[PDB]
Amino acid sequence: VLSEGEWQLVLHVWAKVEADVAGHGQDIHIRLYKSHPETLEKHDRFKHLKTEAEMKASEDLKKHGVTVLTALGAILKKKGHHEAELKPLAQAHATKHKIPIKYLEFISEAIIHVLHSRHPGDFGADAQGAMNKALELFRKDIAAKYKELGYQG
Numbered sequence: 001v002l003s004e005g006e007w008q009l010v011l012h013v014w015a016k017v018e019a020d021v022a023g024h025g026q027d028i029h030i031r032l033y034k035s036h037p038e039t040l041e042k043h044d045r046f047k048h049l050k051t052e053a054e055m056k057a058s059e060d061l062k063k064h065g066v067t068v069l070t071a072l073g074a075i076l077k078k079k080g081h082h083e084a085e086l087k088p089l090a091q092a093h094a095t096k097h098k099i100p101i102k103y104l105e106f107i108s109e110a111i112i113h114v115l116h117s118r119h120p121g122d123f124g125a126d127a128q129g130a131m132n133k134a135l136e137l138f139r140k141d142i143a144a145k146y147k148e149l150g151y152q153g
């Protein structure tokens, strides 16, 4: 469980994300695919994007990153009370897309990296720790929902 202080730090940096959701989402996806190339194979519509500039230029990828961060931000704002928001997400990623928990660790690393790169004055040690705890809780709870659906990834 996170303390109220830790949730406030999470939501404080998230308000910064919200000034440019698209760009944060592009940088996160580009970092993810570059750091952990096995992840990009899950997206057939993104495979022809070979360079960073091609990735940034893709409206499809840009919209997808907003879809992703919108869902995540709605989850974070519930401060752990997120079952109703996690179920549809788990259902899609366990039954349709088949995304192992390890890939959710990889995108968590990419989120932390990009938040630090863009907002270092608002993402110091305690804020990084708070966001780490929140993403860990997200991953723990989505893993339990995965197993309820019969997926052990």
Ligand code: HEM
Pocket (backbone or CB within 6 Å): 039, 040, 042, 043, 045, 067, 068, 069, 071, 072, 089, 092, 093, 097, 099, 103, 104, 107
């Ligand atoms: C913070 C973590 C993540 C969040 C919040 C998130 C959210 C979403 C949302 C809201 C959708 C749209 C509804 C749907 O079609 O299911 C989606 C689609 C998708 N997700 Fe994720 N997701 C995350 C991580 C990942 C990761 C790590 C991968 C794979 C490496 C992945 C692969 C996909 C794929 C393949 C789709 C379908 C895209 C399409 O329709 O073309 N996601 N995600």
